[PDB]
Amino acid sequence: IFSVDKVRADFPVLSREVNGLPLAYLDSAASAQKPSQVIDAEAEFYRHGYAAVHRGIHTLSAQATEKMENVRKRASLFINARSAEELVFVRGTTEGINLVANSWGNSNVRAGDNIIISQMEHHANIVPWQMLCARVGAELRVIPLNPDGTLQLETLPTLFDEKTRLLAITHVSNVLGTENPLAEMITLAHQHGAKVLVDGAQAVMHHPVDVQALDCDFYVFSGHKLYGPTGIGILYVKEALLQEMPPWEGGGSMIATVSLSEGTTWTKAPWRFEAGTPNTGGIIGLGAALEYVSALGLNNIAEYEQNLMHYALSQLESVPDLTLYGPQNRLGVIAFNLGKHHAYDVGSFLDNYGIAVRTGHHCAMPLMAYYNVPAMCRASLAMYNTHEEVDRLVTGLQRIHRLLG
Amino acid sequence: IFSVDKVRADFPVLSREVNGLPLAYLDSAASAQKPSQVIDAEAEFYRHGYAAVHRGIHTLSAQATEKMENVRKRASLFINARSAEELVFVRGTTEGINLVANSWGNSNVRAGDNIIISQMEHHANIVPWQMLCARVGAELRVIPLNPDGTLQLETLPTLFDEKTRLLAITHVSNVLGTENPLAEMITLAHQHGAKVLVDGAQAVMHHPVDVQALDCDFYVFSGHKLYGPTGIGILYVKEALLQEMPPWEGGGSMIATVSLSEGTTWTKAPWRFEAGTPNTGGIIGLGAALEYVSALGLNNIAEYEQNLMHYALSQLESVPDLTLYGPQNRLGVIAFNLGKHHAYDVGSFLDNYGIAVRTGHHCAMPLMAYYNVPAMCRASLAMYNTHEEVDRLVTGLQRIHRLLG
Ligand SMILES: *Cc1c(COP(=O)(O)O)cnc(C)c1O
Ligand SMILES: *Cc1c(COP(=O)(O)O)cnc(C)c1O
Ligand SMILES: [Cl-]
Ligand SMILES: [Cl-]
């Protein structure tokens, strides 16, 4: 069972002060703080084992190469992929979606075809598809929202047809905390021969994820939201698909042969998709982040976070004129607005109290437009956040309401 | 003036042992070791100031955003760019070339046009242009090599014509150590209305670089070869060009507005070219690497390295049957083969002595083919390497020759 006090002891940032006040970091959905175990694993790699990794012969380079492929295997086990070779190292969720949109999209989505997204998607899972649709002359269809922040699943018959090549869908909304019924939707998409990319950037830190059970064709997430370093993420692709995909970025390490007269040939996947020096330091840190999370246990994390979320929603009932957005069973984040006050001002006052929340459109402008607001506040309730921090948020909103009403 | 002993004290890896023997790291051209100042600057950011950066309102996020834009300014001063807004953060040299090849290349290189590269280019500065040429139906022309590892500049009249859209050229060869006469070549390229991308990945650590004096249109380099963290590099583009370039990767932070009915608009450059969460940790580390190098002084580094290189070349004369590749005035690297022995075996014996060199084709297969060898050994002589390490290399090659002859 989970002890939030022992977990918080691993996170040096949580002792920091802001504005002279103790920090309450409620913005993990934008990016997560990192434990000492992750920070030090990367630092120690730099301090004692650093070298280039492309299977160099000397010892440090050979050992660094092995460390990197071991992290690839560990990540594949973390999401229950069948093979380490189904995982590609990318900069983050965003780059992984762009890689799919170009390598797979350009070869599989043709003029007159359509791609389906939802109205709750992050811009990372919208813009690459808008670009692809403009490149090839395809149509971008949209699953709309219900008022409670769930998908209008009844619209799926009008959106899926025989020209639907891809569903790109969020696992968990970064704003609403809605968890979408992926297994269901993937079954339906596969009935039409459509592939499914899942944006898992807000899923992998909250509960176990199993891509064989999901049967998704692509799955993406970012290391820095998973208590890991910036600059690294994971793209999972089914082996049979990944083996047919052409390269995206070109350069060293993704080639088999390079000739200026007879052209160039590519190596095998996933290495075909990793051009140039990888982010070895980020990969080491990501491996340590996975070990740290697995040691705590994702079901223990999920239990503690669900109880924290239930407590926050119960306490926020005592805030006057508070508008919440999204379903009651939300994961990870609480999106809200306070009376008629602009989110920017609410977030400013909260920051003035030492409380870090995110304000704005949260890279989800279509979602904001659906709710007819320009912005929202959002509080993340992660595994190192406490009841007392929730109390500080509730009290802060009460004070703000009273001061500005 | 330069003190190699004080510099080496900053680098914790240099005390490491390999095979039970003290490490001689002569592979900095593949990737450089990092000083404590760089390692700790990144670690301390994670420990005390970490947050997401897209101009979030709360304090940590606002301060992190400022740290990132300050590094952008520091990098622009480091290469004497006119404006911080001419620099784009990329994963490394390779990604930066791919970004140019797609964003600029797709809009400016048409069927029947030509692009000029050289026979000494790294694969990073070949493959993206091969891909572009195949995409748009253009021709990839090649400046050939002289036996001494310099460009056959006499061939330039037959290669430049009015259809030449781009010269992509290495500043310093990662194999030969040749420094190309960029200012000259850029003048000639501009006479034809061609743009010039410079691959500076092996230049920026050896002497000052000044892109206004060079007048190059694009310039790329990687942080990890500049004593900095992996996963981060710099693409410089002339403002007037960069402002016309369309985005490459799509997603959060590079947009102005996103609509599912009225389409999407882009923000201003360079931010238009940075999609999703940046590698904030790598950027912090890169800033510290720039400060560290500037504190030592690039002219002091260049002086010490030039004298070390002169010493090594003088000492290597006492190795029987040693073949050197490249010009006498080489920078940074010594490429060699020992008698008829395969580079792989020579490098294995050297690693067995604790000496890390690189063997293989060094991501320069066309260069290897020019010299009619499959592979070379390469020893890097960087600012923290010593005369004694050169002595160990010379003695090792002598022992290898005697044992295997
Ligand atoms: C290493 C190198 C590259 C590639 O840099 P990455 O950091 O691997 O992207 C490109 N060009 C030259 C000359 C190099 O030495
Ligand atoms: C943050 C996020 C992304 C983007 O991740 P990056 O790490 O910035 O690339 C994509 N999707 C969702 C749902 C997110 O929360
Ligand atoms: Cl290669
Ligand atoms: Cl955005």
UniProtKB/Swiss-Prot annotation, chains A, B:
Its main location: cytoplasm. It catalyses: (sulfur carrier)-H + L-cysteine = (sulfur carrier)-SH + L-alanine; L-selenocysteine + AH2 = hydrogenselenide + L-alanine + A + H(+); 3-sulfino-L-alanine + H2O = sulfite + L-alanine + H(+). Pfam families: Aminotran_5 (PF00266). Pathway: Cofactor biosynthesis; iron-sulfur cluster biosynthesis. Changing residue 378 to A: Loss of function. The active site is at 363 (cysteine persulfide intermediate). Its cofactor is pyridoxal 5'-phosphate. Induction: Suf operon is under both the Fe-dependent Fur repressor and the oxidative stress dependent OxyR activator. Displays a strong preference for selenocysteine as a substrate in vitro and is only very slightly active using cysteine. The interactions with SufE and the SufBCD complex act synergistically to enhance, up to 50-fold, its cysteine desulfurase activity. It is found in: Cytoplasm. GO terms for cellular component: cytoplasm. The modification N6-(pyridoxal phosphate)lysine is found at residue 225. One of its GO terms (biological process) is sulfur compound metabolic process. Homodimer. Interacts with SufE and the SufBCD complex composed of SufB, SufC and SufD. The interaction with SufE is required to mediate the direct transfer of the sulfur atom from the S-sulfanylcysteine. This is Cysteine desulfurase.
